[PDB]
Structure formats: C-alpha cells, structure tokens
Design a protein around this ligand. Structure first.
Ligand code: MG
Ligand code: MG
Ligand code: MG
Ligand code: MG
Ligand code: MG
Ligand code: MG
Ligand code: MG
Ligand code: MG
Ligand code: MG
Ligand code: MG
Ligand code: MG
Ligand code: MG
Ligand code: MG
Ligand code: MG
Ligand code: MG
Ligand code: MG
Ligand code: MG
Ligand code: MG
Ligand code: MG
Ligand code: MG
Ligand code: MG
Ligand code: MG
Ligand code: MG
Ligand code: MG
Ligand code: MG
Ligand code: MG
Ligand code: MG
Ligand code: MG
Ligand code: MG
Ligand code: MG
Ligand code: MG
Ligand code: MG
Ligand code: MG
Ligand code: MG
Ligand code: MG
Ligand code: MG
Ligand code: MG
Ligand code: MG
Ligand code: MG
Ligand code: MG
Ligand code: MG
Ligand code: MG
Ligand code: MG
Ligand code: MG
Ligand code: MG
Ligand code: MG
Ligand code: MG
Ligand code: MG
Ligand code: MG
Ligand code: MG
Ligand code: MG
Ligand code: MG
Ligand code: MG
Ligand code: MG
Ligand code: MG
Ligand code: MG
Ligand code: MG
Ligand code: MG
Ligand code: MG
Ligand code: MG
Ligand code: MG
Ligand code: MG
Ligand code: MG
Ligand code: MG
Ligand code: MG
Ligand code: MG
Ligand code: MG
Ligand code: MG
Ligand code: MG
Ligand code: MG
Ligand code: MG
Ligand code: MG
Ligand code: MG
Ligand code: MG
Ligand code: MG
Ligand code: MG
Ligand code: MG
Ligand code: MG
Ligand code: MG
Ligand code: MG
Ligand code: MG
Ligand code: MG
Ligand code: MG
Ligand code: MG
Ligand code: MG
Ligand code: MG
Ligand code: MG
Ligand code: MG
Ligand code: MG
Ligand code: MG
Lengths: 66, 199, 88
RNA sequence: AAAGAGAGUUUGAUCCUGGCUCAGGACGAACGCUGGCGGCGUGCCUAAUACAUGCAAGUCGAACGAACGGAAGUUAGUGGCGGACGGGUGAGUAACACGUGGGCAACCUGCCUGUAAGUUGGGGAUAACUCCGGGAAACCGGGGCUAAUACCGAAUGAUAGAGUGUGGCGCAUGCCACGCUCUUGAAAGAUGGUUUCGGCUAUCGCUUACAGAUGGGCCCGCGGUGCAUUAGCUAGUUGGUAGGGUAAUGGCCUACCAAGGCAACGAUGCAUAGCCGACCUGAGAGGGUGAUCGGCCACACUGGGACUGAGACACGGCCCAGACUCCUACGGGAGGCAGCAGUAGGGAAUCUUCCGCAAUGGACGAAAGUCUGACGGAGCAACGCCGCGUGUAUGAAGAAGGUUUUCGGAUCGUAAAGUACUGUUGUUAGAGAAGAACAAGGAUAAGAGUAACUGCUUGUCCCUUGACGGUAUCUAACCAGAAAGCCACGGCUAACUACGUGCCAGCAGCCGCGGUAAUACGUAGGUGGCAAGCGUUGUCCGGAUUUAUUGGGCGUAAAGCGCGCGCAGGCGGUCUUUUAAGUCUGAUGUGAAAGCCCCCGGCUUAACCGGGGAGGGUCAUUGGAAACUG
C-alpha cells in the first residue's frame, strides 16, 4: 500500500489482467473462504480493467454499457 | 407524469382497481408477469405493511421522497396521524382538478396543471404539489378555455364530492371545507401506513 | 466610535437589513451591542420598524447614524426629536 | 404533552446463558455504471509541505518650499491620521484557554457625545533643493540654503505632589464631599463674513479637567480526557519585613528572615486535544463530533528582542541567529500565499491566474473623491436539499416479435400501431423589472448663536448614480418530437422461470450454494425496489438491557477474596425544642445572534428567507415553608 503496509487482496470477477509491478486500488471487504485475505481489489479504477462480457450487475466489476 | 409506464398492471399487482373500476377486473384480475395465472403464495407482515404504502403512493401518483416528506409534516398536526395524511394529500392541486371533473385521470389532471392551463385566485400556478386552502377559487383563465380535451372530460365526470363546489359555466372550483377521512378512499388501512414508517 | 448601521442578511439578490448598534471596528455581520429594528428595501413602499426610544437614548451617548440610516430616521421622524431634546 | 418492533446462527430434537452477523439514520466523503433542467447552499479532512505570476493599505494641497498656463485653473517630498481593523489557519496549549457567575475601595482607554476654562508671547533647526565624495547594485557620507498644525524654552492655569482643617461614611487594607498653605505641569493654526486697517466673528482644529459610551487588563467559585504496569513533587518553592517596577494588586523582581507549600477528594509524569453556541443518532437518559455560520483564544518560515503608539512585543513593520531560494563586479545584498486566484508535491480525494465598488460596512478628507481579492456578483463540480420534466385520453380476447408450453396456450400487453390533444421544458422572435437609499450641488422655511453677517442644526421641493444584465420575468408560433438508468429476485427481505457449466468457472453480510435436471454461479425473459439516479467502501449512533442511574448479575452457565482484627470512608433505634446546610417555593439580573420546536408572513409551491414566542443553569442577589436528611 501507499502507506507502506504489505497486505493480501482478492480479484473478483471472471478473469483479470494483473501482473507483477501493477498499480491497483483496494477497498474494504473480507472473503470468508480465504484465511488471510481481508481486502478486495476494485475493478475498473486503475491499471486493473473491467470484466469481459458482463451483462448485469455491471456497476460492480467496472464494465461499461454494451 | 413522473411515472410514464403502463398504468394498468399496477392495479393488477396491488389488487385494487384504481380510478373507479375496470383496470383490475373484466380482464385478467391476477398479478402481471410470467407467473401470474398460477403459483400463488402467502404474504408476511412486511408484505402487508409494504403493500399498503404502494396503494397510496400509486393512487395519487407521487414519488417516494415526497411521500416521506408529506407524511412527516402530516403528523405534526393535532389528531390521528393516519387520517391527517390522506387529508393533507387530498389538498393537492392535482387531486382538486381531478375531483372537479376537468380531467379524466390524475395523469391528465397533473399535465393540465403542469402546462399552465389553470389558475388559482387569478394567478397562474404550475406546481402540481401546490396545497390548496379553503375558500380559494380555481379557474382556467380563458386561453385554452373551450378546449376539446377539457370539455370532453367535463361530460364524463360521474359525480362531484360534497367538499368541492364547481359549476361548468365559469369553471370556478373551490374547497367547501376540509374533508373527512370516512369520505376518502375507504379501501386503505391507514394504520398499516404509520406502522410501516415506525420500523 | 459606536455608530448605528445596517446588517445585511437574507438570500442571494434578496437582501434584508437589520438595524444594529455596533462599533466601527467589528465585522459587518459580527458583534453588535443591540438591535433596534429592520429595513426591507425590496418592498416598493419601503417599510421600516424602529424603537424610537433606544435610538434617542443611544444618540445622547455618542452614536452617529450612517448615510442610509439618517434618511430612515428622518423620514420616520425622530431627528426632529433629537433636535428638540438637544436644545430644550 | 411525550412514550421503546425484531431476525439468522451451538443441538438428533429442547430450554437457558452467550458472543458474531443483518434489516434504520447521517457524512465537507471517495470509487463503479449512468446522466435533462431550475432554485438554495457546500467544495485540500493529507504536507502549519515548497512557492512561479498578478492583485489584496492607503489618504489629506482647507498644515508647509514644484511642472503645464500672460502668471488664471489640475498632478512628487516633510507633516497628520490610518496600517493593532477587515482576511487566513488549528501547529501549540490539559490552563482562569474556554463556558457560566462574580470582584476591582487595585486599573487603563485614540476616535465618538456633553459640560467648564483658555487657545498668549519667542527661539534654534532640518528634509526637499544645490555641489562634492564612495560602491557593481542596494544605497551610504561631507559642504551650503529654506518652511510648517514639525521641534524646544517662556507668562498664566491642577481635584498632579506635600502639609492640613472639617464633616458624612464603608467591607480590614480604606471611601466621598468641601476649605486653607506651598511647589510643579498647556497649546496651532487653517478656510471664510464683516469692518477699517483697530477688531469682531462662523467652521474645522489645539491644550487641560470632569462625566457618558466603547474597547481592553488583573483576580476568583463551579464545569467539561486516557494511563497507578506513572508515587511522591517543589527551592523564588511557601509565608513575612523593606525597596524596585507596572495603568493596576501580587515573589512580578531584589536583599534579609523562617521552612515551608501540593498530593490517594490522584500531585508529578507520559499520551492525546484549540474551547463553546451547536451537529448526528437516540423513546428518553446518554453516545460520538466540534467542517461550514457566530463568540473567545493561539499562531504568521524556525527561535529571541525591543522601538513608535491610546492600543503591538505587530500576517503583507524593524534588529540578531538558523534552514532554504535568488542577484553579485566576491566586497556584499534581497526574500517569506496558514490574503484572493494559481503552480508543483502528498493523497482515494476537493474549483477561476474572472467582473465591480452599483448596495452594506471599513481608512483618509470639510467635500466631491481615492483605496477596499472585505463584500456584492459571475465561472467549474449530481457534493447535498427542494421542485418536475422524459408526454396525456381513448383504444384487441390481444397486431408482429421475443420468452416459455404435456404444443391447446400463457406472458411481455393497452403497452403497440390508429384517432384525438397539450407545450412544463425545447427552437425561433418580440417586451423588459425590483434591488436606488443616496452623497454632493440649488432654492426655501424655522431655530440656537450673532452688533451684523458668512456659517451651523432640522423641514420641503429640483437634479443625480447598476458589475450582475437585456439577467429574472411575459406572449407569439412549430415540434411527441432531443431527454432512463442502477441494484436485487433461497431465508433474513418485496420480487421466479429457461438455457450453459459440472466442487470447474465462480458467489458470499450470516446460514452457506456449486460433485452432467442449480428459483443461490453466467446469460436471457419476467418481476420488485428507487429514480437523475442507483450500488460498494470507510466512519459514528441505534438495534446492544452487550458496563444495566433510568435498565443486569455471582449454587451448577463468566463471576463471593481461604479467614479474621480493624484506620479512613459509606450507612445508621424512639421522642421534644431550636437552626436552616441539603430539600421545596416567589421576585429581580442574566444564560448573545443564528440553530431545533410553536404561531403568523413572503418568494407561482417547496427548499429558503423574515416577525414574535418558547425552551435551555446542581447560575448570582433577596423573601418565605419546616415534613424529611444534616
Ligand atoms: Mg452478484
Ligand atoms: Mg424602491
Ligand atoms: Mg445442526
Ligand atoms: Mg443474542
Ligand atoms: Mg430507528
Ligand atoms: Mg441500511
Ligand atoms: Mg450530461
Ligand atoms: Mg461522467
Ligand atoms: Mg488544512
Ligand atoms: Mg512550520
Ligand atoms: Mg512575488
Ligand atoms: Mg483593485
Ligand atoms: Mg496650497
Ligand atoms: Mg482639514
Ligand atoms: Mg504628494
Ligand atoms: Mg483578526
Ligand atoms: Mg491546536
Ligand atoms: Mg476551528
Ligand atoms: Mg467572564
Ligand atoms: Mg533658522
Ligand atoms: Mg546634507
Ligand atoms: Mg547641514
Ligand atoms: Mg502655573
Ligand atoms: Mg507652566
Ligand atoms: Mg483632542
Ligand atoms: Mg477583541
Ligand atoms: Mg495580577
Ligand atoms: Mg478547572
Ligand atoms: Mg511590598
Ligand atoms: Mg512565582
Ligand atoms: Mg497533571
Ligand atoms: Mg435505546
Ligand atoms: Mg442530548
Ligand atoms: Mg478549511
Ligand atoms: Mg509554510
Ligand atoms: Mg509607547
Ligand atoms: Mg516576532
Ligand atoms: Mg502589520
Ligand atoms: Mg499576538
Ligand atoms: Mg491582522
Ligand atoms: Mg504574505
Ligand atoms: Mg536573510
Ligand atoms: Mg491560497
Ligand atoms: Mg494535485
Ligand atoms: Mg497524486
Ligand atoms: Mg463600495
Ligand atoms: Mg461607502
Ligand atoms: Mg471626519
Ligand atoms: Mg491599490
Ligand atoms: Mg477587483
Ligand atoms: Mg463573495
Ligand atoms: Mg446540481
Ligand atoms: Mg459519482
Ligand atoms: Mg412469436
Ligand atoms: Mg406471439
Ligand atoms: Mg416556455
Ligand atoms: Mg429573444
Ligand atoms: Mg424579448
Ligand atoms: Mg449610499
Ligand atoms: Mg445634500
Ligand atoms: Mg437656508
Ligand atoms: Mg435662514
Ligand atoms: Mg438642510
Ligand atoms: Mg431580449
Ligand atoms: Mg405569459
Ligand atoms: Mg403540437
Ligand atoms: Mg419473500
Ligand atoms: Mg442446469
Ligand atoms: Mg440470493
Ligand atoms: Mg443467478
Ligand atoms: Mg433481465
Ligand atoms: Mg423495472
Ligand atoms: Mg429529486
Ligand atoms: Mg449515495
Ligand atoms: Mg458502510
Ligand atoms: Mg446502551
Ligand atoms: Mg447477564
Ligand atoms: Mg449476593
Ligand atoms: Mg465447570
Ligand atoms: Mg464457575
Ligand atoms: Mg467463602
Ligand atoms: Mg467511622
Ligand atoms: Mg434517624
Ligand atoms: Mg453521619
Ligand atoms: Mg439564544
Ligand atoms: Mg406562504
Ligand atoms: Mg430561518
Ligand atoms: Mg426566530
Ligand atoms: Mg421539625
Ligand atoms: Mg424557622
């Protein structure tokens, strides 16, 4: 993070485009299945792009109107 | 016309025939959708309370936010909260024009008020939510005057409530006095409205 | 030097003034000693309500009306009384 | 008057205890998808980080020595007033800083208002100007000349000082009034009327004294935060005597003398924080916060100091030291946006290098007038609240086409399409407000003052001024035409069917769904909540009686010290008399304005804005009652 803390996030949606050395925006939210994951990566805010071929619930996952 | 959708299913979903009768009965009286004819189900306490709100909101045809605001200031009066709510809503300029017979439906009345076709105390008013007082005169102020739509709706007007006075030569409507709860709707449970907003 | 002056309040392009007594040093809408009356300029016959007793009390202690106030007090007619009580 | 909703989850099933999660409301919010308008407000919460470039504080020729003009009429410097107001920020500060209530017989106060005495007589200069000298530049020296409401003596004048007489007094120190003796302390002219020229006089000023008003200074009772895994702290510290200093009391300071002062009713220390009116939530009691608006405080690159002044230890003043940037001819010089805009950086995150002094209020002036990034307006951003537009009415056992069907049908759907109608909004063209009171200038009238004017005060007429802006607002016509998205549909919780996948992809706040018939994953059709929005995240209150005063408990669920003796503290049998600290009650003063609430009124309604009222205190002075505690 920008304040110098090393955390573990989670990518929602079907398929992504993340690689090492990539800038992303994280937001609150814990995933129950994963032991240590406590944050969610928002999709469509920065280098991370929206999910491909999303028809409904598009405000999440950051996919624009088709 | 804030809600421009089909004004036929809302009567079917609610189960009460808005604007007299015919919207619900005669045709399919059951709810709209794929699973209308079959697949009935029970209603919980939340459903019964919520369904009462929808009748008042869609009968007078106004938005949710106003409904909450006019409910709050209705309960600031002295008396029964539920009864004061319909009395306060009955005061709206849309309803008075509907009651006088100048329009067939509330949607027609709302547009009639909207497009500066009426006047109160000789001053043009374009706010549908204007709250009419007792004794004020409402007219048309010539211009449209002998308009086919307004004249057609004058003939098909059934009856006129006793708390409004109107003669079809000068079109000078007026509120005789503040109305009474018994003579309004009589098919709504105001006790459920007030319980819905207290949760 | 304490002097009586208007105080602007109201909405955008709808001014409404409240006649107050305050020092020249203090802000236009800040500290004041006390309030005397109001002034509506928007009304075509401009209407003003004044105490007619606290003004005369203050003007014998070193209070000076401003440019607009003097017109208000003269039209209402208490500067005549300030004249008469001064010499009498 | 007001007055309180629950649900899921431990088990094969149950009842209790108990935690976790959810349904509501609010942001100076951010992010995602989408996006028509108008009114009213709001917009660097982080780096009190560093700052290009413009503008934010001047004014007076009616206080004193110049350039255009045949010497008429307008424009630098000395001098006065103002720069201590207005505007910004929240670093520090746990204390008389603030809130509330008092005291000052212990204090100061320019301008403003009233009253009383006068505004008399001289002297020596020096800026500007003119030469010389030094230096890159900032700017520094020397010689000569001149004026003032500049500066310094002099006459006269103290309720200023000393020594007293009397009275009337108060709260201990002491106060008020009058009288006597002695000694000190003041000043300025300018602009006009008259006369004569003596002189007089009007206005603005000048000096002293006393009142009022205004603004401040000092002291005190009470009130509002975490840690005892922080127990001692202090030495000008505590008190006294004499002096110094201040507007004023005081260890405020100094010499001497004594050893005191504070603390378990929490000193000291560490950590955090500007305080309040108020804001959000709550049935209430309370819990959290202190952005915008108003009051007080502290700060002005970081430390220290003082000058001038009525007022400063001074945001756009000075001196020294430090860090940083810049100009140097290497000798030396110049700076401070936490002012309005704007730039870089930090950040998930916040606007224009705009128009005016027309209105209000400021500084100067006698007045026009000058200055005012205060303030009025405009610009950008769905950031919030409020209003209403994306069309109305009639119209099929029911158009086509989707989507399903035990293939008959059902649903989208009166929604289409058709006929009839409207112009809020749009486009075009015409009319066009309020906000303006003024000031000054001109005639008068009446007054106080006059030997008389000029002039001063009040009254009535004439004339004059708009950034917004041709803005708001009307009427004339044409167009259904340019204007609907967002989230959910197993339960909590309103709303279900097909196809694809096959413990994979994936979903999720909790219970938990997915392992070739998934109402829970993905897409369709349909539906449900809202709507110019809708969802997610972060923070706070509620539900949470889950710190229980209102309003919980300790046999077995967490929870009675292993037991005693006892200092401090808490509580205490019966009756009578008295007192009045607690208790109850009346009056007076105060608890600002704005905000919540109640009653009216204006914006075409609302939001919003005015007028009146109410509430709000373990508050101060004073008068009562005596049952209860003392
Ligand atoms: Mg989903
Ligand atoms: Mg006017
Ligand atoms: Mg089980
Ligand atoms: Mg429980
Ligand atoms: Mg609630
Ligand atoms: Mg909610
Ligand atoms: Mg748009
Ligand atoms: Mg956009
Ligand atoms: Mg800041
Ligand atoms: Mg600093
Ligand atoms: Mg500069
Ligand atoms: Mg300027
Ligand atoms: Mg001259
Ligand atoms: Mg002068
Ligand atoms: Mg000059
Ligand atoms: Mg200030
Ligand atoms: Mg601070
Ligand atoms: Mg603050
Ligand atoms: Mg005080
Ligand atoms: Mg001389
Ligand atoms: Mg010289
Ligand atoms: Mg000389
Ligand atoms: Mg003398
Ligand atoms: Mg003398
Ligand atoms: Mg003087
Ligand atoms: Mg002050
Ligand atoms: Mg003191
Ligand atoms: Mg204290
Ligand atoms: Mg002493
Ligand atoms: Mg001391
Ligand atoms: Mg301490
Ligand atoms: Mg509660
Ligand atoms: Mg409270
Ligand atoms: Mg701020
Ligand atoms: Mg700085
Ligand atoms: Mg001084
Ligand atoms: Mg300093
Ligand atoms: Mg300064
Ligand atoms: Mg200071
Ligand atoms: Mg200042
Ligand atoms: Mg500055
Ligand atoms: Mg320097
Ligand atoms: Mg700035
Ligand atoms: Mg930036
Ligand atoms: Mg950045
Ligand atoms: Mg101005
Ligand atoms: Mg002015
Ligand atoms: Mg003056
Ligand atoms: Mg200037
Ligand atoms: Mg300007
Ligand atoms: Mg402004
Ligand atoms: Mg907007
Ligand atoms: Mg947005
Ligand atoms: Mg078909
Ligand atoms: Mg078909
Ligand atoms: Mg129009
Ligand atoms: Mg036009
Ligand atoms: Mg026009
Ligand atoms: Mg004026
Ligand atoms: Mg005049
Ligand atoms: Mg005259
Ligand atoms: Mg005369
Ligand atoms: Mg006059
Ligand atoms: Mg025009
Ligand atoms: Mg019109
Ligand atoms: Mg048409
Ligand atoms: Mg259900
Ligand atoms: Mg399947
Ligand atoms: Mg679900
Ligand atoms: Mg699904
Ligand atoms: Mg769908
Ligand atoms: Mg829908
Ligand atoms: Mg709305
Ligand atoms: Mg939102
Ligand atoms: Mg949240
Ligand atoms: Mg509680
Ligand atoms: Mg318990
Ligand atoms: Mg017990
Ligand atoms: Mg056990
Ligand atoms: Mg036990
Ligand atoms: Mg025991
Ligand atoms: Mg004892
Ligand atoms: Mg007893
Ligand atoms: Mg006792
Ligand atoms: Mg108040
Ligand atoms: Mg009204
Ligand atoms: Mg208000
Ligand atoms: Mg009020
Ligand atoms: Mg007794
Ligand atoms: Mg007694």
């Amino acid at each position: 993070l920008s304040n110098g803390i090393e955390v573990t996030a989670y990518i929602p949606g079907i398929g992504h485009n993340l690689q090492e050395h990539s800038v992303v925006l994280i937001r609150g939210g814990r995933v129950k299945d994963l032991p240590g994951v406590r944050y969610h990566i928002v999709r469509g805010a920065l280098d991370t792009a929206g999910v491909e071929n999303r028809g409904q619930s598009r405000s999440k996952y950051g996919t624009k109107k088709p | 016309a804030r809600y421009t959708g089909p004004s036929w299913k809302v009567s079917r979903r609610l189960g009460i025939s808005l604007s007299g009768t015919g919207k619900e009965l005669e045709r399919r009286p059951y709810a709209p959708g794929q699973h209308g004819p079959t697949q009935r189900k029970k209603i919980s306490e939340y459903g019964l309370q919520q369904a009462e709100k929808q009748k008042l909101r869609h009968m007078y045809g106004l938005t949710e936010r106003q409904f909450k605001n006019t409910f709050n200031k209705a309960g600031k009066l002295q008396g029964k909260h539920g009864e004061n709510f319909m009395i306060l809503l009955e005061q709206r300029l849309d309803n008075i024009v509907y009651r006088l017979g100048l329009a067939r439906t509330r949607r027609a009345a709302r547009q009639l008020v909207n497009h500066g076709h009426i006047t109160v105390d000789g001053k043009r008013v374009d706010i549908p939510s204007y709250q009419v007082s007792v004794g004020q005169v409402i007219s048309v102020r010539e211009k449209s005057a002998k308009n086919s739509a307004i004249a057609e709706s004058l003939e098909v007007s059934s009856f006129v409530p006793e708390y409004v006075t109107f003669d079809a030569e000068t079109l000078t409507g007026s509120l005789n006095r503040l109305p009474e709860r018994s003579e309004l709707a009589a098919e709504i449970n105001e006790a459920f409205i007030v319980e819905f907003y207290s949760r | 030097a304490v002097k009586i002056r208007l105080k602007r309040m109201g909405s955008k392009k709808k001014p409404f003034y409240r006649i107050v007594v305050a020092d020249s040093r203090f802000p236009r809408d800040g500290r004041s000693i006390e309030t005397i009356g109001t002034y509506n300029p928007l009304l075509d016959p401009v209407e003003v309500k004044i105490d007619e007793e606290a003004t005369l009390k203050w003007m014998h202690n070193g209070a000076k009306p401003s440019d607009t106030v003097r017109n208000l007090l003269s039209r209402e007619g208490i500067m005549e009384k300030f004249h008469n009580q001064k010499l009498g």
